[PDB]
Amino acid sequence: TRELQSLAAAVVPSAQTLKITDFSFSDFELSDLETALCTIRMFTDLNLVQNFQMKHEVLCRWILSVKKNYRKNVAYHNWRHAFNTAQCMFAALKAGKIQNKLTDLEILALLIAALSHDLDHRGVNNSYYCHSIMEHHHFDQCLMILNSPGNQILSGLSIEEYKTTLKIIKQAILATDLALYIKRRGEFFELIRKNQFNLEDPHQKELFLAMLMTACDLSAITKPWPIQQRIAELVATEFFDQGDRERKELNIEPTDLMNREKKNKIPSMQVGFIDAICLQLYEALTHVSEDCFPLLDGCRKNRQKWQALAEQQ
């Protein structure tokens, strides 16, 4: 197609030029083409392209297939969300020096998981066990796109490497289920508090990869004020939109969190979210690698901003 040809023939700027290494990155002013280019640069600079012999044309087709399976009409959970979640992964890996800690297969899987973790989201969200139903669909959608002809970027992996990487991908995507985060963090935080966290440990690695997946998933809560505010409105819009649709299809009144009225509470809500969900995660990630401090730092600054508003409100 015309779009595939343009992407495959375009020049991919450097990571430094695309500024995808900084945790303060923002996609707002980038076109759809520029994001895909950034995506390519990510697979490139993590050495996934050559270490796994990826055919440039196939990588481009896959990236387009993944971006396609996201619905733009969905306020927040769309391609830009997936792209940013992946960009945070890259930054954490590079700027956050998390790369030397993982294997190429783990990295390969994480990048892929990051890009496809919310595939075909329909704007139906939760509150806080639901058995990761939503996440399961996101994986099927991911698996499918990896099997579709000319989209098989995992060709070149031995049978075992494929079976391995697939498991890691499945787990990373499902990990993005907040219910699972709430379930597993307790153990993670305790290992970090007792200064006995060990990545050399299979299970503690699986736990780390899960925690890392969630940190990137929520990266927006750590971004610079302009950006955070801008994305919180996408999030708010999705929720309110859901409350309306739900009161329509069903006869159920929206929770304050999801009904348009009572929007004056987003500041108050934002503080609670950060306190109960984000902060601990980013403070813990910083314990695993101080180079991730930027995330924790920005999460904090965001709380100050939201706290002020919640009162001044």
Ligand SMILES: CCCc1nc(C)c2c(=O)nc(-c3cc(S(=O)(=O)N4CCN(CC)CC4)ccc3OCC)[nH]n12
């Ligand atoms: C996909 C939903 C999760 C998510 N991702 C992001 C980036 C965001 C974000 O900025 N904000 C929210 C977000 C989260 C909650 S909450 O349900 O977690 N909240 C309920 C009440 N309790 C107090 C007892 C505190 C916690 C409430 C409002 C929210 O956002 C309004 C924009 N959720 N969110």
Ligand SMILES: [Mg+2]
């Ligand atoms: Mg999800």
Ligand SMILES: [Zn+2]
């Ligand atoms: Zn997500």
